[PDB]
Every structure is written in C-alpha cells, then in structure tokens.
Amino acid sequence: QIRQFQRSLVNQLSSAEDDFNSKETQLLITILSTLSKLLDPGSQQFLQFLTWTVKICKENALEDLSCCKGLLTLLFSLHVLYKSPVSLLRELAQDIHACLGDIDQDVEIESRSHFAIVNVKTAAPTVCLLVLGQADKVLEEVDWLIKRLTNQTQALEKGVILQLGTLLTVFHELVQTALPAGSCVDSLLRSLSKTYAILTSLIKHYIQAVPGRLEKLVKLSGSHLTPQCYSFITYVQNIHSESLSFAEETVMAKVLRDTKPIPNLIFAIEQYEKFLIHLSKKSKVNLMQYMKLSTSRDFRINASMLD
Amino acid sequence: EIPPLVYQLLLLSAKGSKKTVLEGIISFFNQLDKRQKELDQLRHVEGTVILHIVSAINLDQDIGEELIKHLKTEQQKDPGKALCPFSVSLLLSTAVKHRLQEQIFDFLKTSITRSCKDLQILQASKFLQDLCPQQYDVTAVILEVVKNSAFGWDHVTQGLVDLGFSLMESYEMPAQQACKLGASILLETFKVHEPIRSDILEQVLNRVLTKAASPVSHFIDLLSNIVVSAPLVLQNSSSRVTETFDNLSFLPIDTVQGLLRAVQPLLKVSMSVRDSLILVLQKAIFSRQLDARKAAVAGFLLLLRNFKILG
Amino acid sequence: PILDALSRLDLDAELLAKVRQSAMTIVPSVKLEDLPVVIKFILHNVKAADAVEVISDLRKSLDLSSLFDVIKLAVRFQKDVSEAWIKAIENSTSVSDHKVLDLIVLLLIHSTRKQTEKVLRSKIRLGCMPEQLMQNAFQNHSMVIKDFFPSILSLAQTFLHSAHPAVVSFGSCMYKQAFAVFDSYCQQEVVCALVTHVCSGNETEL
Amino acid sequence: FPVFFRVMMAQLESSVKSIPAGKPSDSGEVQLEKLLKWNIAVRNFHILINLVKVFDSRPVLSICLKYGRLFVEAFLKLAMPLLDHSFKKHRDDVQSLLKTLQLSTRQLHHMCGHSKIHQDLGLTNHVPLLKKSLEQFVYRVKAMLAFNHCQEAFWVGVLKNRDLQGEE
DNA sequence: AAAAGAACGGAACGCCTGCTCTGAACCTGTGCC
C-alpha cells in the first residue's frame, strides 16, 4: 500500500507549484507515518523504505512548511528504533551553516547542499527546532543509562562518548551560525544548559571509581564548543539589540525573557567546571590545559547617548 | 530434613549474623526452583520453611528491618535483579504481619513503576536495548509467583491479595500498566487460590462501591472478569445482591451498565436480586430530578435484554 | 419538610442562591434533631465552587452546636467534595482560633480526601490547634471515634515521626485520647500499635 | 583579620537586605531619601573588596566570594526595582552609583578566575552561583535601561580577565 | 599532618501564565468584473 502511495506523492512533489494542493501532501506524509508504525521490526522493507525517503528528502525540496516538518518527523520515527541520527543532524547542520553567514562575519562556506530538503527559505525553526527536539530526546535517553551506569561497562562508556562526542560536533556547527532570533535561539540555550548537566553525572559517577578517551572528549569539548558559545553569546547581544528595535516602531517583560537562558548557560558551564575541577585533583591529571579561562562580560552606560 | 536444618540455621542467625545467611538461603531456594522447574513435596517443604521464617520474623520484627536496606541496596546495584519469587514471597508474608508494611509497599510500588518505565523505554528505543540488554521484568516474576505459591501456602494468598489491593489504588502509561498488572494478578489468584475466593469477592465488593467520585472502571472490569470466571461465587456471597444497589444511581459514567452486564447471569439465576432491583426501579424512574435519572432508564433498557424472551 | 422537598428537586439556577442563603440563615435555628436534616439537605444540593465561602459560613455557624454522624454520610455521598472544604477551612483557621467541627470534618475528609493532613501539619506546627481543644473534642464528640478506628492510625502514627515538638505533642495527646475510648477491639489495636512503635521506631518515639 | 572581615561583610549584607524594596513610583522624594543609602553601602562594599587586595588569605577569599555573591543578589532583588523609577528624576546619582557598583563587582570575576586557577576546592565551591549572579546583574541593568527607553545607551563588553591586582 | 565534627553545603517535587503558536473573516488591489 505504501508503494501505491509513494507514486502519488513523488508525482505530486515533482509537479509544479501551480498544482500543489499542500493539504493532500501533508496527508500523504502523515499516512506514511501512521502506516509505518507496524512494519516488520527487522524487515527488509523497513530498510528499503528508509533508503527511498532519505533519497527523496536529500533530493526533493518540500518548500511547504508542514510538508518539510511532516516528512522530517517520519524519517526519525524509523531512524530511532534502528540507529542514531547524529550523522544526519551533523549533515543538516552543515547546510544551515552554508545557508547563512557564520557568527564570525569574516568566513565563507561553499554550497555543500547535502540535503535538498533544507534551503535558504527553510532556515526558520522549521528544521532547527525539530533536530533540537531529537537532541532533547537523544540526551533524554542518555540520562537513563547514565543513571543505570551510576563487565560490559566499558562498552557502555564507549557508546555514550561516541554519541555525545558526535553530538558535541553538531552543537559546534549550529553555534557558529546566525540562528533565527525566534524561540530557536531560546531552545538552543535550553538544550545547551541541559547538555552540560549530562556531561557531569557520568563524570560525577566516575569520581567514585583516568581514561584518555574521556580526556579527548573534553579536549574536543573545550576546543569546539566553549569559546564559540561565549562568542555566540556576544552574537546574541547584536541580534537582540537589532530585534528589539521592533517595539511598535513596557519592554521590561520582553528584555528579561530574551536573555533569561543566558545566565543559566554560564551556571551550567561552571557547575560542570567545578566538579571537573574536583575530578582533576582527585584524578591526579591536569585537564585544564586544553580548556580556556572562563570569560565574562561587563557593561557601560552611555551617558552621552542619553542626551 | 531441610526444614529443621534451616530452622536451626535461622536460630543461629538470630544468635549470630543475618547479613549474608538470608541471601544465601534465598539463593538456595532460587536454584532449587530453577532445577525443579524443568515437585509438590519440595513445594510443601518450601511452604513449611517460609512459615517458620515468617513466624520468626513476626516474633522479632526489628530483625527483618535489615531486609529492607539489603534489598534496596541490591536493587540499586542489580538493575531489577534480586526480586526473585522467594524474596517477594518473604516481603509479602511479613506485610501480613502488619509491621512497617507501608514502607515495603511503597518500595514495591517504586520498583514496579521503574520496571514498567524501563520496559517502555527499551521497547520504544532499541538503541538502548543493544547497549543495555539487562531487561528485567518484575511483572513476569510476580505473575509466576501466583503459580509458585498455588500449593497451599501459609500466607502467600493473603500477601498476594494485599499486594493487589495496594496495586489497584496505586494505579489510580505507567498507571495503565500498573492497573493491568493488578487486575491480572487478582484474576490469577482468584483462579488459583480457591479457599480465599469468598473473602476476595467480599473484599472487592466492599472496594467496588468505595470510589463514588473517583473512576472505578478498573474495579468493574476486574469484578466482571472474576464473576465470568466463577459465576456462582457471588451466589455463595449472597446477602450482597440486594446490598449492591445502595447508591447505584449517583454517578453513571457507564459504570452502572458495566456492573449490570457483569452481574447479569446472577440476576437471571437469582430471583431475589430481580425483585430488589424492580423495587429500586420505582424509586429510580420516579425521581423528579434529571441529574441521575438517565442511569435508571439505561439500566432498565439493558435489563429488558438481560431477561430472556422465551415463549 | 419543605427544605427536604425542594432539595429533592432541582429549581432555577438564579433561585438557588437565595434559597441557599435562607438555608444558612436557618442553620443556627435548627434543633439538635432538626439542624442535621437541613445540613445534609443543603450539603447534597450545594455543588458550586463559589460555595467555598458558604462552607466557611456554615462551619462558623455550626461550630457552637458541633446519631449526628449523618452529616458525615452526606459528605461521603460526594466522593470528591474535599477541595472546597479544605480551601475554606485553610482560609478560615488561618485567622480563626479553632473549631471542633473543623477538626471533625478534616478527619472525615482524610478518610473521605486522602489529602487533609497538609493543613493539619501546617496549622499545628504553626501556633494553632491546641491539644486541649482536641482532647475536649474527643471527650465530648464521641462520634469521632465512632466515625472510624484507623483515624488514630492515620493521624497519631504520622504525628509521632513529626520533627516539630508541637506535632509530637499533638500525636501523643491524640494517642492518649484514643486509649480512653471504650472500643475493646479498638483499644487493643491501638495498644498493639503503641507497643509496636515502642519496640520499633525512633528512639524519641520509643 | 579574617573573622573581622567575615562579620563585617555579614553585617553589611544584612543591613543592605534590610532596606525597603522598590515601590512602583509610590513615593515622591522619599526615593531621594532611599537612594544615597545605596551609595554609601556600595562605597563600603568597595572599601571592603579593596581590603581584600592586601590579604590573600584563603578564608578571606572564600568569605568574600560567598558574601559578594549574596550582596549582588540582594542588590538585584531590592535596589533595581526602586532604581528604575528613580532614573526619571535622578540621573547623575544612579549613574554614579552604578559606576561604583560596577567598579566593585569587577574584581569578583578576577578572583573567581584566581580560585579556578589555583584549584582551591573551598574556593571553587562558590564560583558558579557568583558568576551566574553577576551575569544576572549585567542583564538586569540592560532591562532597566530598556524599560526607561534608554535601551540605545546600554552596551555589553567582555571583561579582561586578570589576577588579583594584576593582568591576564 | 591534612585526619574528625557538626554546623555548614546542598537536593527534590509543586506552580499556574504573560508564552507564542494558532485564529479569522477582512479589506484591500487589481486583473478582472
């Protein structure tokens, strides 16, 4: 039945936007998701359906809002019970990075259009909210095993550091880009606060137990995440100031919310840091050479500008 | 042979130490049950030894206090392990002792909630199953406990019925799984524990009309299952067919329809129940208000098909 | 009789408020065998969330007068009548000194509400509900023990573990009052629970 | 000296917290009588944190971390809700007061950096909350300026990390 | 010397908002009516 439905969708999707009927296309995607719930868990058609949809997603461009969101929701439901999607999220992060300009404002990127589903017009939370939702789920299940982790434990630690390490590269890609100023900026800082906390309980567990693999994760964590994150914080100042100009031309409420995650981002950095300090002395290893001193910012009231 | 020897060993533990001897005898029973699974005399020996140990623990309740800490530590270490039929049987037996049973019940509830949450997590993500294959199911062992203790045990039936009574209220997703588990264990013990059938029926009838404001759909479901399993149980539980109509016309949320359908064989084999419901019908239908008169007419309409139309 | 008849029926919504107000006005005038009749008739009829003030006023009016367990049956008829009563009494007892019917209905809600100790643990731990009032209630209102036996097991047992000295004092007073009951089975159960607490429990509890 | 210093900050913070909160412009010229108090309090805090510079004792650093965090939290909780309304009539006073407070809070970042540089367990026990509170103050100042339509003037900038009475 | 003690250091469940996605006939503009 899916085959009879795939033909209609690809014919509709390949057709010109004049004959689009996006309402049917959204239904054409939801029926796929609702009919993909009861496939054979180890069936070949499970893999075959995945091979087709990633081809369509990476080739076609579902310019419609829900069509892109709906199709992307489907592919993850199959790509959860079978594998981990951090490779896809990393790949998508490249396209949005290629879609816009970097935070540094002095570096350019090639087209690198690995997925055609995402494009310049889809830079909105259309995609960068869903993947962060998976980032929420990916870390949500990680806490469960870490809590259990608190003979095969060597395999347990190796797998987590692979997913977290790959995901750490992902966050590095987004954090260098100019994210849309909507709640996606907020949600990125909400998961960024969450991510550092999960970094702790594994280390907090191992206190009661040295490996260089853990150090290499920390070395990558310091190099590709922290200075970019703080620089990304400096980016937010420019974005909010420009965005706050749209004040119809009592902004107390908006200003507080627009910078609420920022302080707690710092705190989640140092609570991990304070216990990572604790580990270094108890672990007899100097882990701070890779990392950098925790930077901070001051302000200044422009008296002349008040005139 | 073994019962007196382990009784002497328990006396020695009372004189000596109990940290490891308890776990050792649990392990011995565990491998005995494993080797006997693939044994009625052995089961009678098991009943005798559990009776001896539960009597000893009831005499000295504080001696068994270390069991709680030991099992909590094991559960923290072992992910779902150590909840063998022997351990849970010992836990339920001392619950009937009425000493600190509330904390043991709370620990059991936390354990089963964690177990069903973990089962859902593993089912909803295979990536955790590959790295965490230690899928331990408390439901499987507790349901096997019904068959394990179905050989005339001293207090296994009482422990199981108390466990189910706590479970059904704990259910109030994880709540649905808890309700399903409680209903299944109650059905199993009703189909197994013959001499507690009347007591179980009376207790659930007392509980069935126990949550007027709160939903009791699970109650009516379990009552219907036990009645359809044993149609004449409530017949031996007489003087309650008339009693069950105390406040039936207060909160019809389909509860009245389910109750009527569950008890329908009793009405068609019990003329006194039919007469009493006829008497209640005059009061129900003549209620000037309309807040609850819908339940009366719905029940009467169902009854019209309840009685046969032979002739 | 007219109050019972009208409560047996359902009138217009607007006219419900005025007849309800007439009901609480006539509540104090109801005699010992007559006031409970109107009390249950209006308690069954009243099902309004705005009736929290009505419940507070009824508690204030019936405090002086305090089978007579029929009011407990009327409150039991409503399965989930806890919220309005507990909010009304929390608002009231935060200012009012105390009330015997307040404690009685709080106990009734615990064994229906399964959630009533929260104000109890709060007001007792914060300068309210003197043990003398509870002792006088137990001595006079014998229906409290006649209401149900696990009241002592529901309240005093948890009161022993309380950290506040007022909490444990109240628990000890409740246990002492419960020992004074004439129920031989209830007294034996209470004494067995007491010796269980003495044998096993916190050293202060022992 | 350290016990002197600890009790001095304790009493200073208790007095600061004892100040009335910020009414929504419910007073005319009473705010004037409730403004210079914060000026002298910030001056006292500046004097104490300068006293830190001489005595590098570990307990001194610990108590200063803890009670500077507590004081800045109290400032955020109480003063600024009052300070936003006083900004209308009073401009130079609040600006100078903010200058003094910012001068005071500058050294807390440096000494937190020193704490994490020296791996002082007792000292690293208090760094995260202090850093979060300082960030909260930085952003509350912007909030108040934007509330009084002075959002153009405000500007954030990275603070050059330094050791105690040093650089880098 | 860098060990305790217990007073110092610290954690969990509960709350309804000030939130942003969603909503709705409109009123405008312009090829059509």
PDB file of C-alpha atoms in Angstrom, chain B residues 210-294:
ATOM      1  CA  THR B 210     -15.644   2.512  47.502  1.00  0.00           C
ATOM      2  CA  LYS B 211     -14.885   5.315  44.989  1.00  0.00           C
ATOM      3  CA  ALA B 212     -18.112   7.105  44.078  1.00  0.00           C
ATOM      4  CA  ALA B 213     -16.420  10.332  42.981  1.00  0.00           C
ATOM      5  CA  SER B 214     -13.290   8.693  41.568  1.00  0.00           C
ATOM      6  CA  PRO B 215     -13.460   6.459  38.477  1.00  0.00           C
ATOM      7  CA  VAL B 216     -13.873   2.757  39.231  1.00  0.00           C
ATOM      8  CA  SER B 217     -13.747   1.394  35.678  1.00  0.00           C
ATOM      9  CA  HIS B 218     -10.890  -0.954  36.577  1.00  0.00           C
ATOM     10  CA  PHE B 219     -12.935  -2.150  39.563  1.00  0.00           C
ATOM     11  CA  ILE B 220     -15.920  -3.085  37.403  1.00  0.00           C
ATOM     12  CA  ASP B 221     -13.596  -4.692  34.843  1.00  0.00           C
ATOM     13  CA  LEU B 222     -11.935  -6.911  37.455  1.00  0.00           C
ATOM     14  CA  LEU B 223     -15.283  -7.740  39.075  1.00  0.00           C
ATOM     15  CA  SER B 224     -16.719  -8.745  35.698  1.00  0.00           C
ATOM     16  CA  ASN B 225     -13.673 -10.913  34.983  1.00  0.00           C
ATOM     17  CA  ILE B 226     -13.863 -12.711  38.332  1.00  0.00           C
ATOM     18  CA  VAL B 227     -17.639 -13.180  38.028  1.00  0.00           C
ATOM     19  CA  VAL B 228     -17.434 -14.572  34.491  1.00  0.00           C
ATOM     20  CA  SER B 229     -14.640 -16.865  35.694  1.00  0.00           C
ATOM     21  CA  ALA B 230     -16.704 -18.015  38.711  1.00  0.00           C
ATOM     22  CA  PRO B 231     -20.410 -17.380  38.021  1.00  0.00           C
ATOM     23  CA  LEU B 232     -21.554 -18.840  41.360  1.00  0.00           C
ATOM     24  CA  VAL B 233     -19.003 -17.027  43.550  1.00  0.00           C
ATOM     25  CA  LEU B 234     -21.394 -14.172  44.316  1.00  0.00           C
ATOM     26  CA  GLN B 235     -24.156 -16.749  44.788  1.00  0.00           C
ATOM     27  CA  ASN B 236     -22.087 -18.104  47.679  1.00  0.00           C
ATOM     28  CA  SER B 237     -21.545 -14.407  48.510  1.00  0.00           C
ATOM     29  CA  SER B 238     -25.282 -13.865  48.974  1.00  0.00           C
ATOM     30  CA  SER B 239     -26.908 -11.081  51.014  1.00  0.00           C
ATOM     31  CA  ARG B 240     -24.896  -8.741  48.771  1.00  0.00           C
ATOM     32  CA  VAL B 241     -27.010  -8.829  45.595  1.00  0.00           C
ATOM     33  CA  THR B 242     -29.644  -6.739  47.375  1.00  0.00           C
ATOM     34  CA  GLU B 243     -26.945  -4.674  49.096  1.00  0.00           C
ATOM     35  CA  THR B 244     -25.119  -3.620  45.913  1.00  0.00           C
ATOM     36  CA  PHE B 245     -27.896  -1.136  44.990  1.00  0.00           C
ATOM     37  CA  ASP B 246     -27.178   1.224  47.907  1.00  0.00           C
ATOM     38  CA  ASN B 247     -26.202   4.272  45.818  1.00  0.00           C
ATOM     39  CA  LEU B 248     -26.097   2.853  42.292  1.00  0.00           C
ATOM     40  CA  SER B 249     -27.996   5.820  40.803  1.00  0.00           C
ATOM     41  CA  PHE B 250     -25.478   8.530  41.660  1.00  0.00           C
ATOM     42  CA  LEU B 251     -22.590   8.523  39.152  1.00  0.00           C
ATOM     43  CA  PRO B 252     -23.345   6.610  35.926  1.00  0.00           C
ATOM     44  CA  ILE B 253     -20.260   7.010  33.736  1.00  0.00           C
ATOM     45  CA  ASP B 254     -21.036   3.669  32.074  1.00  0.00           C
ATOM     46  CA  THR B 255     -20.195   2.121  35.462  1.00  0.00           C
ATOM     47  CA  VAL B 256     -23.837   1.145  36.025  1.00  0.00           C
ATOM     48  CA  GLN B 257     -24.031  -0.509  32.600  1.00  0.00           C
ATOM     49  CA  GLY B 258     -20.833  -2.461  33.234  1.00  0.00           C
ATOM     50  CA  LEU B 259     -21.991  -3.542  36.690  1.00  0.00           C
ATOM     51  CA  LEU B 260     -25.316  -4.720  35.280  1.00  0.00           C
ATOM     52  CA  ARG B 261     -23.640  -6.630  32.449  1.00  0.00           C
ATOM     53  CA  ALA B 262     -21.164  -8.269  34.830  1.00  0.00           C
ATOM     54  CA  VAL B 263     -23.879  -9.344  37.286  1.00  0.00           C
ATOM     55  CA  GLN B 264     -26.470 -10.254  34.605  1.00  0.00           C
ATOM     56  CA  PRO B 265     -26.058 -14.052  34.975  1.00  0.00           C
ATOM     57  CA  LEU B 266     -26.681 -13.655  38.707  1.00  0.00           C
ATOM     58  CA  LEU B 267     -29.929 -11.765  38.068  1.00  0.00           C
ATOM     59  CA  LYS B 268     -31.057 -14.357  35.541  1.00  0.00           C
ATOM     60  CA  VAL B 269     -30.290 -17.090  38.117  1.00  0.00           C
ATOM     61  CA  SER B 270     -31.320 -15.025  41.183  1.00  0.00           C
ATOM     62  CA  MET B 271     -34.972 -14.023  41.534  1.00  0.00           C
ATOM     63  CA  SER B 272     -34.410 -12.096  44.776  1.00  0.00           C
ATOM     64  CA  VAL B 273     -31.961  -9.771  43.011  1.00  0.00           C
ATOM     65  CA  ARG B 274     -34.512  -9.202  40.245  1.00  0.00           C
ATOM     66  CA  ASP B 275     -37.221  -8.368  42.789  1.00  0.00           C
ATOM     67  CA  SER B 276     -34.951  -5.973  44.695  1.00  0.00           C
ATOM     68  CA  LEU B 277     -33.929  -4.184  41.504  1.00  0.00           C
ATOM     69  CA  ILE B 278     -37.599  -3.966  40.500  1.00  0.00           C
ATOM     70  CA  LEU B 279     -38.287  -2.337  43.866  1.00  0.00           C
ATOM     71  CA  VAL B 280     -35.426   0.124  43.326  1.00  0.00           C
ATOM     72  CA  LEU B 281     -36.770   0.801  39.816  1.00  0.00           C
ATOM     73  CA  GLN B 282     -39.867   2.568  41.146  1.00  0.00           C
ATOM     74  CA  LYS B 283     -37.712   4.993  43.138  1.00  0.00           C
ATOM     75  CA  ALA B 284     -35.255   5.453  40.262  1.00  0.00           C
ATOM     76  CA  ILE B 285     -37.761   6.180  37.485  1.00  0.00           C
ATOM     77  CA  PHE B 286     -39.972   8.391  39.674  1.00  0.00           C
ATOM     78  CA  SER B 287     -37.078  10.675  40.660  1.00  0.00           C
ATOM     79  CA  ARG B 288     -38.409  14.124  39.781  1.00  0.00           C
ATOM     80  CA  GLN B 289     -34.879  15.391  39.164  1.00  0.00           C
ATOM     81  CA  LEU B 290     -32.964  14.693  35.953  1.00  0.00           C
ATOM     82  CA  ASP B 291     -29.404  14.732  37.323  1.00  0.00           C
ATOM     83  CA  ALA B 292     -29.211  10.934  37.631  1.00  0.00           C
ATOM     84  CA  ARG B 293     -32.455   9.555  36.157  1.00  0.00           C
ATOM     85  CA  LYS B 294     -30.551   8.682  32.961  1.00  0.00           C
TER      86      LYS B 294
END
